[PDB]
């Protein structure tokens, strides 16, 4: 719930919870990604490193299936060889920290697969809104 019985909505606040709990409080990690002699050179390069990281993630999000949508589905099915788990054991038992280790070897195939899926769907929408 909230308040006196709360798994705490703070910054990184539920990081050891199960992913069904961390599927709600998701803007709380988004909005703390902007804010923040010779010392001002170090300070300004910290802030432009922050906004360059945030712009690279917004641009990597946008050329897949979602512009800024924050919860985003797409059109490629999920392979058995990436996880071999059921749904209930990852949404009712496992944490996101452990999940990032379990799909650590299966990165940089899923992103190229999203890129082909979105680019072929954009050309499908292009021809489908062309031919009518």
């Amino acid at each position: 719930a909230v308040g006196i019985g709360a798994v705490f909505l703070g910054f990184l606040g539920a990081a050891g919870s199960t992913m069904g709990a961390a599927s709600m409080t998701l803007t709380v990690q988004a909005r703390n990604l902007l804010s923040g002699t010779v010392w001002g050179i170090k300070q300004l390069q910290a802030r432009v490193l922050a906004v360059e990281r945030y712009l690279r993630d917004q641009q990597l999000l946008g050329i897949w299936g979602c512009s800024g949508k924050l919860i985003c589905c797409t059109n490629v099915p999920w392979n058995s060889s990436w996880s071999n788990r059921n749904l209930s054991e990852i949404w009712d038992n496992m944490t996101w920290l452990q999940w990032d280790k379990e799909i650590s070897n299966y990165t940089q195939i899923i992103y190229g697969l999203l890129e082909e899926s979105q680019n072929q769907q954009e050309k499908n929408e292009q021809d489908l809104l062309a031919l009518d």
Partner: antibody, heavy 122, light 104 residues
Amino acid sequence: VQLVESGPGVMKPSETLSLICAVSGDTISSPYYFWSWVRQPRGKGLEWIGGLYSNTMDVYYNPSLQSRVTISRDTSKNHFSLKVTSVTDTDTAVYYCARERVVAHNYYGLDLWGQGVAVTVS
Amino acid sequence: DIQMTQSPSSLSASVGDRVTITCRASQDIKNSLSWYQQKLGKAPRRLMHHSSTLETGVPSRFSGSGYGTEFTLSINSLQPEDIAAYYCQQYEDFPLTFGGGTQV
């Protein structure tokens, strides 16, 4: 450890009601303690104003009185303040600041309260 | 926003009795009420959190039960200091809202 409130109560309407709650014995920078301001006029029920946590920034109110009230908190004097602008006659009440446990992270807290101060607005 | 409703309102029982006070919510909360006891001109002393487990410094003569939306306080051995106010309060979503008010 005791929570001392301050603020005289006799004022004129549509003005600056200000209440201070402060701790003696411990500090307000202790983590995971729900702070609450709750008022009660005599003859009427227990009315909820404000509640937050000790160790974050995001703060919460009742939406039905939200343009009149605001809260503040600082540890340089260990003050926990309620501010009311545009007070009606419906705020003549006793007022309680409260420190409550969060129950998932703290089995060892002391559910502290203020004594309640009486503010009378003519 | 969630409203709370507390029944009954005005009570006066004899000594050694067992009084029950229920309260109901507007949507399902399922685990979340706290019980508070406020004497005359005083700070409210909390009975319990989470409706089934108690606070230290309070004996076993009070109880709470229920599940879901309707919940129930039961005092099995009435003491003469019980003529006061009691309140069930939700903590499901902000804002917190108390009960109506028990005049026992």
